[PDB]
Design an enzyme around this catalytic site. Structure first.
Site, PDB file in Angstrom:
ATOM      1  N   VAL A  27      31.156  44.719  47.159  1.00 37.91           N
ATOM      2  CA  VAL A  27      32.473  44.343  47.540  1.00 37.91           C
ATOM      3  C   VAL A  27      33.347  45.177  46.816  1.00 37.91           C
ATOM      4  O   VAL A  27      34.742  44.985  46.972  1.00 37.91           O
ATOM      5  CB  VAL A  27      32.642  42.695  47.476  1.00 37.91           C
ATOM      6  CG1 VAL A  27      33.992  42.627  47.786  1.00 37.91           C
ATOM      7  CG2 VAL A  27      31.738  42.047  48.047  1.00 37.91           C
ATOM      8  N   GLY A  28      33.031  45.401  45.644  1.00 37.13           N
ATOM      9  CA  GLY A  28      33.820  46.185  44.467  1.00 37.13           C
ATOM     10  C   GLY A  28      33.378  46.152  43.064  1.00 37.13           C
ATOM     11  O   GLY A  28      32.721  45.258  42.606  1.00 37.13           O
ATOM     12  N   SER A  29      33.516  47.428  42.319  1.00 33.77           N
ATOM     13  CA  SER A  29      33.248  47.284  40.925  1.00 33.77           C
ATOM     14  C   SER A  29      34.504  47.647  40.042  1.00 33.77           C
ATOM     15  O   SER A  29      35.624  47.811  40.391  1.00 33.77           O
ATOM     16  CB  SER A  29      32.179  48.480  40.758  1.00 33.77           C
ATOM     17  OG  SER A  29      31.043  48.115  41.499  1.00 33.77           O
ATOM     18  N   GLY A  30      33.938  47.612  38.576  1.00 35.69           N
ATOM     19  CA  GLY A  30      35.229  47.895  37.720  1.00 35.69           C
ATOM     20  C   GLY A  30      34.658  47.463  36.307  1.00 35.69           C
ATOM     21  O   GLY A  30      33.381  47.135  36.141  1.00 35.69           O
ATOM     22  N   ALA A  31      35.537  47.667  35.351  1.00 29.70           N
ATOM     23  CA  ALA A  31      35.355  47.387  34.157  1.00 29.70           C
ATOM     24  C   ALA A  31      34.693  45.984  33.755  1.00 29.70           C
ATOM     25  O   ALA A  31      33.803  45.935  32.676  1.00 29.70           O
ATOM     26  CB  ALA A  31      36.401  47.638  33.008  1.00 29.70           C
ATOM     27  N   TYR A  32      35.032  45.241  34.310  1.00 31.93           N
ATOM     28  CA  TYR A  32      34.624  43.699  34.483  1.00 31.93           C
ATOM     29  C   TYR A  32      33.194  43.584  34.727  1.00 31.93           C
ATOM     30  O   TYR A  32      32.552  42.734  34.400  1.00 31.93           O
ATOM     31  CB  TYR A  32      35.598  42.642  35.145  1.00 31.93           C
ATOM     32  CG  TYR A  32      35.780  43.272  36.689  1.00 31.93           C
ATOM     33  CD1 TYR A  32      34.504  42.915  37.819  1.00 31.93           C
ATOM     34  CD2 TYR A  32      36.637  44.310  37.316  1.00 31.93           C
ATOM     35  CE1 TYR A  32      34.583  43.381  39.040  1.00 31.93           C
ATOM     36  CE2 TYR A  32      36.532  44.560  38.625  1.00 31.93           C
ATOM     37  CZ  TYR A  32      35.569  44.176  39.496  1.00 31.93           C
ATOM     38  OH  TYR A  32      35.747  44.692  40.683  1.00 31.93           O
ATOM     39  N   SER A  34      30.626  43.991  38.573  1.00 33.24           N
ATOM     40  CA  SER A  34      30.235  44.274  39.819  1.00 33.24           C
ATOM     41  C   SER A  34      30.274  43.004  40.786  1.00 33.24           C
ATOM     42  O   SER A  34      29.826  41.961  40.094  1.00 33.24           O
ATOM     43  CB  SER A  34      28.867  45.077  39.953  1.00 33.24           C
ATOM     44  OG  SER A  34      28.800  46.129  39.135  1.00 33.24           O
ATOM     45  N   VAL A  35      30.796  42.941  41.993  1.00 37.68           N
ATOM     46  CA  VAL A  35      30.719  41.945  42.670  1.00 37.68           C
ATOM     47  C   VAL A  35      30.317  42.245  43.937  1.00 37.68           C
ATOM     48  O   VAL A  35      30.372  43.151  44.655  1.00 37.68           O
ATOM     49  CB  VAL A  35      32.363  41.264  43.021  1.00 37.68           C
ATOM     50  CG1 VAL A  35      32.414  40.500  43.953  1.00 37.68           C
ATOM     51  CG2 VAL A  35      32.858  40.951  41.577  1.00 37.68           C
ATOM     52  N   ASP A 165      40.628  34.371  39.070  1.00 35.60           N
ATOM     53  CA  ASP A 165      40.792  35.095  37.951  1.00 35.60           C
ATOM     54  C   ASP A 165      41.165  34.511  36.590  1.00 35.60           C
ATOM     55  O   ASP A 165      42.493  34.060  36.406  1.00 35.60           O
ATOM     56  CB  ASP A 165      41.610  36.364  38.309  1.00 35.60           C
ATOM     57  CG  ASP A 165      40.767  37.399  39.062  1.00 35.60           C
ATOM     58  OD1 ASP A 165      39.944  36.944  39.588  1.00 35.60           O
ATOM     59  OD2 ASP A 165      41.202  38.756  39.147  1.00 35.60           O
TER      60      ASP A 165
HETATM   61  O1  LIG Z   1      36.746  35.145  48.633  1.00 35.10           O
HETATM   62  C1  LIG Z   1      36.726  35.587  47.346  1.00 35.10           C
HETATM   63  N1  LIG Z   1      35.816  34.562  46.639  1.00 35.10           N
HETATM   64  C2  LIG Z   1      35.499  34.642  45.241  1.00 35.10           C
HETATM   65  C3  LIG Z   1      35.815  36.360  44.524  1.00 35.10           C
HETATM   66  N2  LIG Z   1      35.607  36.198  43.432  1.00 35.10           N
HETATM   67  C4  LIG Z   1      35.942  37.486  42.780  1.00 35.10           C
HETATM   68  S1  LIG Z   1      35.406  37.728  41.006  1.00 35.10           S
HETATM   69  C5  LIG Z   1      34.313  36.168  40.776  1.00 35.10           C
HETATM   70  C6  LIG Z   1      34.528  35.169  39.876  1.00 35.10           C
HETATM   71  C7  LIG Z   1      33.847  34.082  39.403  1.00 35.10           C
HETATM   72  C8  LIG Z   1      32.463  34.356  40.386  1.00 35.10           C
HETATM   73  F1  LIG Z   1      31.898  33.062  39.851  1.00 35.10           F
HETATM   74  C9  LIG Z   1      32.362  34.969  41.472  1.00 35.10           C
HETATM   75  C10 LIG Z   1      32.838  36.223  41.312  1.00 35.10           C
HETATM   76  F2  LIG Z   1      32.690  37.225  42.393  1.00 35.10           F
HETATM   77  C11 LIG Z   1      36.586  38.433  43.387  1.00 35.10           C
HETATM   78  C12 LIG Z   1      36.792  39.802  42.706  1.00 35.10           C
HETATM   79  C13 LIG Z   1      37.850  39.781  42.023  1.00 35.10           C
HETATM   80  C14 LIG Z   1      38.058  41.540  41.202  1.00 35.10           C
HETATM   81  N3  LIG Z   1      37.687  42.395  42.099  1.00 35.10           N
HETATM   82  C15 LIG Z   1      36.293  42.271  42.569  1.00 35.10           C
HETATM   83  C16 LIG Z   1      36.253  40.776  43.277  1.00 35.10           C
HETATM   84  C17 LIG Z   1      36.991  38.379  45.004  1.00 35.10           C
HETATM   85  C18 LIG Z   1      36.475  37.058  45.589  1.00 35.10           C
HETATM   86  N4  LIG Z   1      36.744  36.786  46.946  1.00 35.10           N
HETATM   87  C19 LIG Z   1      37.314  37.837  47.774  1.00 35.10           C
HETATM   88  C20 LIG Z   1      38.631  37.845  48.044  1.00 35.10           C
HETATM   89 CL1  LIG Z   1      39.909  36.729  47.208  1.00 35.10          CL
HETATM   90  C21 LIG Z   1      39.491  38.788  48.846  1.00 35.10           C
HETATM   91  C22 LIG Z   1      38.685  39.769  49.384  1.00 35.10           C
HETATM   92  C23 LIG Z   1      37.159  39.508  49.363  1.00 35.10           C
HETATM   93  C24 LIG Z   1      36.596  38.836  48.416  1.00 35.10           C
HETATM   94 CL2  LIG Z   1      34.840  38.709  48.343  1.00 35.10          CL
END
Ligand SMILES: O=C1NCc2nc(Sc3ccc(F)cc3F)c(C3=CCNCC3)cc2N1c1c(Cl)cccc1Cl
EC number: 2.7.11.24
Length: 350
Positions: A27-32, A34-35, A165
């Protein structure tokens, strides 16, 4: 009696998660970190999993990781990202080195909506209402978001919203430079380090956000710090005598008094066609002086939210001890603390 983990090379790194989580996709990566998105077979929920990258590489990092885990574990509100699970393949503090966070998958942030849709005044009522509802909760725990933006606001098909966040690494100056949406929603006091900021900075962000949903355009899309400050003062007027004295920074206060005085414009003529009640609320939020800015609790009782307001259904948070914020410890100790939190975690009742 821990689960059983399986390894898989998702994106540049090797995710090791419990069997319950299947079909993980990037779904996306970064300095923080990976998701990943996934399906939690144990609950039937679609979730988002985040693997922290190098959580204990420095004292500053080991502390940030502890902060984030503490914040997420504390949040128990519908309009705030809750923590569904947190784990580590590690079997002991000695091996401990990876941290995975699990939360609901909403699907889309607030930027998507305001682009591919048409928001009625009723929609704006519901969306902002939920932001303020979650904010009353956050602030009641002396927690400050500091970075409310449409990208930090998740919404699902039912238009339900969750604030996201917390405890993330502060934005580098380069990230705040130029024509970037990472600065457009920040209150002037923090954007230019005018004074010791507080929760009132979130109210300003809500104002910027609410205006955008009403007009469909960015309120203060500055091309840089100065240009953005001008757009702001142009709308709310230049600081008064009382506000200047509160500006600790002698340098900033110096630059301000050099700008030609401007009167606060007429919001009714700025936001043409808007619900008169929306305009009034916007004037209570977009107040230059943070001490006189409306609080989330006060905003929730504003006529603009009559249809949704419910004084018995806008809970506050339990106490949030953040004494660790001024504690000086070594990486190992911040790490051990993080570990204790991971193991003491208790899954949501459902
Ligand atoms: O629907 C969600 N739900 C949780 C989520 N957490 C994160 S970070 C994150 C924080 C805590 C955790 F337990 C678990 C976590 F994943 C990010 C991210 C923040 C920074 N960029 C990468 C992803 C994107 C989402 N999206 C999301 C959104 Cl808002 C829009 C589009 C797609 C998604 Cl999956």
């Amino acid at each position: 009696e821990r689960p059983t983990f399986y390894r898989q090379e998702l994106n540049k790194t090797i995710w090791e998660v419990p069997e319950r989580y299947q079909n993980l996709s990037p779904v996306g990566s970064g300095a923080y970190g990976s998701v990943c998105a996934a399906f939690d077979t144990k609950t039937g929920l679609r979730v988002a999993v985040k693997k922290l990258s190098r959580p204990f590489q420095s004292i500053i990092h080991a502390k940030r990781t502890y902060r984030e885990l503490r914040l997420l574990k504390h949040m128990k509100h519908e309009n705030v990202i809750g923590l569904l699970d947190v784990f580590t393949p590690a079997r002991s503090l000695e091996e401990f080195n990876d941290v995975y966070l699990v939360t609901h998958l909403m699907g889309a942030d607030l930027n998507n909506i305001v682009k591919c849709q048409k928001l009625t005044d009723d929609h704006v009522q519901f969306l902002i209402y939920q932001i303020l509802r979650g904010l009353k909760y956050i602030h009641s725990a002396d927690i400050i978001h500091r970075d409310l933006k449409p990208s930090n606001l998740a919404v699902n098909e039912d238009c339900e919203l969750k604030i996201l966040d917390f405890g993330l690494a502060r934005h580098t100056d380069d990230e705040m430079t130029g024509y970037v949406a990472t600065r457009w929603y920040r209150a002037p006091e923090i954007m230019l380090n005018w004074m010791h900021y507080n929760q009132t900075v979130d109210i300003w962000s809500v104002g910027c956000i609410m205006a955008e949903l009403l007009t469909g355009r960015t309120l203060f899309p500055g091309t840089d710090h100065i240009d953005q400050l001008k757009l702001i003062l142009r709308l709310v007027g230049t600081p008064g005598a009382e506000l200047l004295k509160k500006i600790s920074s002698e340098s900033a206060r110096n630059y301000i008094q050099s700008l030609t005085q401007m009167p606060k414009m007429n919001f009714a003529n700025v936001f043409i066609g808007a619900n008169p009640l929306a305009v009034d609320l916007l004037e209570k939020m977009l107040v230059l002086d943070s001490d006189k800015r409306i609080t989330a609790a006060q905003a929730l009782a504003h006529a603009y939210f009559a249809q949704y307001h419910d004084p018995d259904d806008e809970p506050v948070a339990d106490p949030y001890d953040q004494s660790f914020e001024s504690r000086d410890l070594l990486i190992d100790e911040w790490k051990s603390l993080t570990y204790d939190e991971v193991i003491s975690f208790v899954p949501p009742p459902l």
